[PDB]
Scaffold this active site. Structure first.
Site, PDB file in Angstrom:
ATOM      1  N   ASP B 314       0.771  -1.267  -0.048  1.00  0.00           N
ATOM      2  CA  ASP B 314       0.111   0.065  -0.098  1.00  0.00           C
ATOM      3  C   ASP B 314       0.743   1.310   0.080  1.00  0.00           C
ATOM      4  O   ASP B 314       0.114   2.257  -0.471  1.00  0.00           O
ATOM      5  CB  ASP B 314      -1.296  -0.196   1.046  1.00  0.00           C
ATOM      6  N   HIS B 435     -10.198  -0.894  -2.794  1.00  0.00           N
ATOM      7  CA  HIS B 435      -8.970  -1.084  -3.699  1.00  0.00           C
ATOM      8  C   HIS B 435      -9.282  -2.199  -4.855  1.00  0.00           C
ATOM      9  O   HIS B 435      -9.850  -3.311  -4.326  1.00  0.00           O
ATOM     10  CB  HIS B 435      -7.908  -1.625  -3.022  1.00  0.00           C
ATOM     11  N   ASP B 437      -7.406  -4.128  -6.110  1.00  0.00           N
ATOM     12  CA  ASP B 437      -6.676  -5.204  -5.759  1.00  0.00           C
ATOM     13  C   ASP B 437      -7.711  -6.449  -4.954  1.00  0.00           C
ATOM     14  O   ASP B 437      -7.684  -7.833  -5.009  1.00  0.00           O
ATOM     15  CB  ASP B 437      -5.359  -5.525  -4.674  1.00  0.00           C
ATOM     16  N   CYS B 609      -2.296  -7.841  -0.232  1.00  0.00           N
ATOM     17  CA  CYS B 609      -2.173  -6.645   0.697  1.00  0.00           C
ATOM     18  C   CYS B 609      -0.764  -6.551   1.594  1.00  0.00           C
ATOM     19  O   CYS B 609      -0.483  -5.528   1.762  1.00  0.00           O
ATOM     20  CB  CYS B 609      -3.389  -6.557   1.516  1.00  0.00           C
TER      21      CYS B 609
HETATM   22  C1  8FW Z   1      -5.535  -5.152   0.432  1.00  0.00           C
HETATM   23  C2  8FW Z   1      -5.089  -3.720   0.463  1.00  0.00           C
HETATM   24  N1  8FW Z   1      -4.429  -3.404  -0.490  1.00  0.00           N
HETATM   25  N2  8FW Z   1      -5.122  -2.860   1.631  1.00  0.00           N
HETATM   26  C3  8FW Z   1      -5.363  -3.382   3.227  1.00  0.00           C
HETATM   27  C4  8FW Z   1      -5.198  -2.317   3.950  1.00  0.00           C
HETATM   28  C5  8FW Z   1      -6.095  -2.435   5.095  1.00  0.00           C
HETATM   29  C6  8FW Z   1      -5.903  -1.736   6.215  1.00  0.00           C
HETATM   30  N3  8FW Z   1      -6.316  -2.042   7.471  1.00  0.00           N
HETATM   31  C7  8FW Z   1      -5.796  -1.581   8.716  1.00  0.00           C
HETATM   32  O1  8FW Z   1      -5.018  -0.816   8.738  1.00  0.00           O
HETATM   33  C8  8FW Z   1      -6.578  -2.259   9.986  1.00  0.00           C
HETATM   34  C9  8FW Z   1      -8.148  -2.265   9.646  1.00  0.00           C
HETATM   35  C10 8FW Z   1      -8.642  -2.680  10.958  1.00  0.00           C
HETATM   36  C11 8FW Z   1      -7.923  -2.997  12.203  1.00  0.00           C
HETATM   37  C12 8FW Z   1      -6.569  -3.132  12.133  1.00  0.00           C
HETATM   38  C13 8FW Z   1      -5.837  -2.562  11.214  1.00  0.00           C
HETATM   39  C14 8FW Z   1      -4.509  -2.736  11.290  1.00  0.00           C
HETATM   40  O2  8FW Z   1      -3.379  -2.169  10.600  1.00  0.00           O
HETATM   41  N4  8FW Z   1      -4.311  -3.030  12.650  1.00  0.00           N
HETATM   42  C15 8FW Z   1      -5.718  -3.271  13.210  1.00  0.00           C
HETATM   43  C16 8FW Z   1      -6.354  -0.309   5.837  1.00  0.00           C
HETATM   44  N5  8FW Z   1      -5.751   0.592   5.527  1.00  0.00           N
HETATM   45  C17 8FW Z   1      -6.799   1.883   5.465  1.00  0.00           C
HETATM   46  C18 8FW Z   1      -6.507   3.274   5.009  1.00  0.00           C
HETATM   47  C19 8FW Z   1      -7.511   3.792   5.023  1.00  0.00           C
HETATM   48  C20 8FW Z   1      -8.765   3.575   5.457  1.00  0.00           C
HETATM   49  C21 8FW Z   1      -8.878   2.111   6.111  1.00  0.00           C
HETATM   50  C22 8FW Z   1      -7.765   1.258   5.819  1.00  0.00           C
HETATM   51  N6  8FW Z   1      -7.575   0.084   6.234  1.00  0.00           N
END
Ligand code: 8FW
Ligand code: 8FW
Ligand code: CA
Ligand code: CA
Ligand code: CA
Ligand code: CA
Ligand code: CA
Ligand code: CA
Ligand code: CA
Ligand code: CA
Ligand code: CA
Ligand code: CA
Lengths: 627, 627
Positions: B314, B435, B437, B609
């Site tokens: 990302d 996304h 992906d 991811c």
């Molecule tokens: C598959 C891909 N390309 N993206 C995956 C990014 C998912 C991220 N998730 C988290 O950061 C997260 C979500 C829920 C609980 C937790 C976490 C974490 O890292 N630790 C606990 C992600 N990135 C974003 C950015 C903006 C909005 C939402 C997001 N979720």
């Protein structure tokens, strides 16, 4: 779209006319099954009389007309195999018209140039049909005058649906956030899209309806704007109150924003401009008569608005903009911002007269920013490549140093973004003031390509004065007519080594543009004419006019307003005057010579510098160009 | 150029080889005269054996070789008439070579695309061959390492002149002020043109000389930079100490700045990226083995640099840039700026690894800015129009509202300015994270067009689970393998009305991209493959994965790293797993299933991811494209 059918369950769908609809038959086909049939209501045409269950062979659906009611066309897929009794999958379709329409034929899916091309036209609404205000129409969020609509581009939404169709569907109109600062749209009369609003739910009824929108642009093409605007209509399914709206249909229309186009001296004059100041009266009568002779309206700026500023050519340039439904002239106001600062804002800009400006308004500019340094050629063809509205011409130095000047980059960028007059930079920096009006003009011609180019030419003058000295007028006085100035005889002038040097060098600077203009405008020597003209170098070895600069003339058709050279008098006439006449009159040109000596010349300009002209726009439509 | 000759006086001139030189004979021709002859030194070839004095017929001069000394080729024009004895006009010419040269054939006057086209190539020197510093090579005014030269574009000046020629002439090199912020040039090693210096007098000797310059670009193509740089060489006459230098010659070379190009999943992997964090070890061994199987270098980010951030896909995307003389990979660092903020700056960017970034670094961004939302198709042809490096694919909403998201405009603009992968916007906003992906992948294929597209597909899963329920496994448990989670039987899942509703709606969002991708990539159903995948809508009715999202896989060649679905177990194997295998293995793909359940999935992502891949650049040279 691909519709997936089921013996499990009957399927419901919408179908926009003019769209291709297709059927996935295999994915959910029950077993015991080898073969299928399609049966359909008469409104539905079906393309591929019974068939094997092969996922590679395609079924296609077109509806002939809009539905009167939800589901009212039906399709039936019969699955069957040897042992097996028919199992049916039912499909209910609703047909609808959704036509977003605009004048894409240019008569009143993407944008393409030329006579065969497609794409609607859209005008920057930069005039002021509002009689009260100071501002351009396009700066507020309202249509204030019916008149104002005549500038705007019409777009219509045509629907036909069942009468209850907008229970379950809603139409949205939108434009990219990328572009909402460059467009505004009015429903018919209130605003719906603009820099604040990028999308709008339209409040539409079932059955037949038509909805007119009026569109204005807020920005000309520039370095950061190619000049395309897309508006999209989406149809949303809102049948499910628990789920989000899901897209069912989008359609688009493309506007191109009309460029700002300039007019050469060989377009029929319409209006002339000048300044009344102290001790300039005899000048203005000559112009007024010359204007009258060419049937031109005549506009003067009185001293109380002038603020000493007599150079009416230099603050501005009167171009136009053009659409199938409206054309209007538009003032390119120069950032030079001298005494004449307000003339374009206050008294030119108006109803059916536009305004545009570029570059830094406080400081940061130079002489090359004045529009004595901005001209256009007349139409040419260069090695087969057409320029049906000419090629803008503007002065530059030959390379950048700390001593050089240029026209501000924001202007150069603007002029190139208009594309259709393909700017050509020239070398004018060698002059004190540095404007291409100081060595070139064009004038109409009855033959060849319909013009001749005029170039200042010392060589021509050295010859002329040599021809006299030869025939016995070596004593003849340049500047006869002016007491309060020291007359010089032809003999003295010719034998002045320093003067000759100066003019040699000016000849070089000039010749370099002759070849330049020969290349980029595709001219031949027979398209060019030389004017005898003498210069002298002064502060910083920059070039000035020795006697009034005749090529700095006003072109009102066949009536030329030329600066009075006060050349040496032979046979009761000035010989320069006579030399121009022998060159111009063969072509139908009537040469008036206007004394600008103590008014303009001693202040570093002449007749063209004192004035300006609105001229008739080309008939040729810029969009039929292929730049 | 036009040289004007005189019986009055002998003329001196310079003549650059490869230029057309012409003669004005009439203008100053003495009288008593009807006719002329040209006689010339053997070095001069003269085209039009005696001729009438007609100003319309043309004389042309080409010199065969460079002069050894000033004036050393001579031309003689004899004017003659019936009564009259010959009068001669003498001309002294000096021939010179002036060749500014660059690799315009792309092998090691304007810029044109394609195999038949012409124009030099120039690379943004955005790597860091300097071992010490933090900065990109291109930010200072020095070459610090010989190594650094290998990135730069070579340009040479070749002169041949008489030995005293630079007594009277001087050569300047320059570039527009418009472009000096986007280029730098080094003489061979010191700087001569750059953002500070727009022109330079070259210190050159007579006789034969060669002068190499090395050129670096400082900016990729963008909304305000088409990507062309012109450098010009001028030759000045400085013979006269009293007058200014007057131009005698200019010549130019055009560089195009190499775009930033991305690599699809069907380009051979070279290097894999991931994060080591708490309790993620079993994940990384699966990857490490998978990396090893495909002979990929393997790069990990340890927790002390991570800062909790496990999403290596990302923050970044590893593209490349390519010139005839050098290719190197280049990191598009995403402005998302989370824990992984420094990975691209500190440990990716380096010697022969470039860096670029766009958009607002402090605030102002959204999920769609992450590069899980930035992919590329593999090469396609769309109705005849070739895309030999594919088409960038990125997620958007269907229209702008206050609830919608988009990828920042500065990124969209950047990606379009690279031109050669013609971005296509997709509809991904319907997802929680949003996304592309999350519903598409591509994988190599031995036949058809050499790939298949993968799409998440509830329909496929509903079918799969229905096929089991039918054959007696209606009790089979999804999530077998996970204690600490509530297992659900196939029978319960199938009969859950709300779940079905959710997945219907996701099917719509998805299908809409299928058709979208079918149109803009020119795909047929036979190019596509569906993966059984179930989603569910959650906060703000945005879509999430029900079980691990298999299409979110890592593509290392024929080795796929797929998320372990933990599907219902029938015949000692999970049936989803088996269903993918029956779809992938026919094509030579080896499907590993990697448990990312408590590490990645419950944190809203999967294997793709968690990771990233540098892949081999296309052999095809982007400049042979005609976009
Ligand atoms: C598959 C891909 N390309 N993206 C995956 C990014 C998912 C991220 N998730 C988290 O950061 C997260 C979500 C829920 C609980 C937790 C976490 C974490 O890292 N630790 C606990 C992600 N990135 C974003 C950015 C903006 C909005 C939402 C997001 N979720
Ligand atoms: C022919 C043309 N298009 N331009 C003419 C503008 C000449 C301007 N001259 C003067 O303003 C001027 C010069 C010398 C004495 C006087 C004046 C004047 O108005 N009153 C006395 C002109 N404009 C500029 C702008 C920048 C530099 C030099 C200029 N000269
Ligand atoms: Ca208004
Ligand atoms: Ca108006
Ligand atoms: Ca102004
Ligand atoms: Ca109007
Ligand atoms: Ca002008
Ligand atoms: Ca450096
Ligand atoms: Ca380097
Ligand atoms: Ca970052
Ligand atoms: Ca390097
Ligand atoms: Ca990516």
């Amino acid at each position: 779209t691909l519709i997936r059918v089921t013996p499990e369950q009957p399927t419901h769908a919408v179908c926009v006319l003019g769209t291709l609809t297709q059927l996935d038959i295999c994915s959910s086909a029950p077993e015991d099954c080898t073969s299928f049939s399609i049966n359909a209501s008469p409104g539905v045409v079906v393309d591929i009389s019974t068939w094997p269950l092969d996922p590679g062979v395609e079924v296609t659906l077109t509806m002939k007309a809009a539905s009167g009611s939800t589901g009212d066309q039906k399709v039936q897929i019969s699955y069957y195999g040897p042992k097996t009794p028919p199992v049916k999958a039912l499909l209910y379709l609703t047909a609808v018209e959704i036509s977003l329409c605009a004048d894409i034929t240019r008569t009143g899916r993407t944008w393409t140039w030329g006579p065969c091309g497609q794409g609607a036209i859209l005008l920057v609404n930069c005039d002021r049909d509002n009689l009260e205000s100071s501002a351009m129409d396009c700066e507020d969020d309202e249509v204030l005058d019916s008149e104002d609509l005549q500038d705007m581009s019409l777009m219509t939404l045509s629907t036909k649906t069942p009468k209850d169709f907008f229970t379950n569907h809603t139409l949205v109109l939108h434009v990219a956030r990328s572009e909402m600062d460059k467009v505004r749209v009015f429903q018919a009369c209130s605003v719906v899209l603009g820099p604040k609003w990028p999308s709008h739910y339209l409040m539409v009824p079932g059955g037949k309806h038509n909805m007119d929108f009026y569109v204005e642009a807020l920005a000309f093409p520039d370095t950061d704007f190619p000049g395309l605007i897309t508006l999209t209509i989406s149809l949303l399914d809102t049948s499910n109150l628990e789920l989000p709206e899901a897209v069912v249909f989008q359609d688009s229309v493309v506007f191109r924003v009309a460029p700002w186009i300039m007019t050469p001296n060989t377009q029929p004059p319409q209006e002339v401009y000048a300044c009344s100041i102290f001790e300039n009266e005899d000048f203005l009568k000559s112009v007024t008569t010359l204007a009258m002779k060419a049937k031109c309206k005549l506009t003067i700026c009185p001293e109380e608005e002038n603020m000493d500023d007599q150079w009416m050519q230099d603050e501005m340039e009167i171009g136009y903009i053009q659409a199938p439904h409206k054309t209007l002239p538009v003032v390119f106001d120069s950032p030079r911002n001298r005494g004449l600062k307000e003339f374009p804002i206050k008294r030119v800009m108006g109803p059916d007269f536009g305004y545009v400006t570029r570059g830094p308004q406080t400081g940061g500019i130079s002489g090359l920013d004045s529009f004595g340094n901005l001209e256009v050629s007349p139409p040419v063809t260069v090695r087969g490549k057409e320029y049906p509205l000419g090629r803008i011409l503007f002065g530059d130095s030959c390379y950048p140093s700390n001593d050089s000047r240029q026209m501000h980059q924001a202007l150069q960028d603007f002029l190139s973004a208009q594309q259709v007059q393909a700017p050509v930079k020239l070398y004018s920096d060698w002059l004190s003031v540095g404007h291409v009006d100081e060595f070139l003009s064009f004038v109409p011609a009855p033959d060849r390509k319909g013009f001749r180019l005029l170039l200042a030419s010392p060589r021509s003058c050295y010859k002329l004065f040599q021809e006299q000295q030869n025939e016995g007028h070596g004593e003849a006085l340049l500047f006869e007519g002016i007491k309060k100035k020291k007359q010089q005889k032809i003999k003295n002038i010719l034998s002045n080594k320093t003067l000759r040097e100066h003019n040699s060098f000016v000849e070089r600077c000039i010749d370099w543009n002759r070849e330049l203009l020969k290349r980029e405008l595709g001219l031949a020597e027979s398209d060019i004419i030389d004017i005898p003209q003498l210069f002298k170098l002064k502060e910083f070895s920059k070039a000035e006019a020795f006697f009034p600069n005749m090529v700095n003339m006003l072109v009102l058709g066949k009536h030329l307003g030329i600066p009075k050279p006060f050349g040496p008098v032979i046979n009761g006439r000035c010989c320069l005057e006579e030399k121009v006449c022998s060159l111009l009159e063969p072509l139908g040109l009537q040469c008036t010579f206007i004394n600008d000596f103590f008014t303009y010349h001693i202040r570093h300009g002449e007749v063209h510098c004192g004035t300006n002209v609105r001229r008739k726009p080309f008939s040729f439509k810029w969009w039929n160009m292929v730049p």
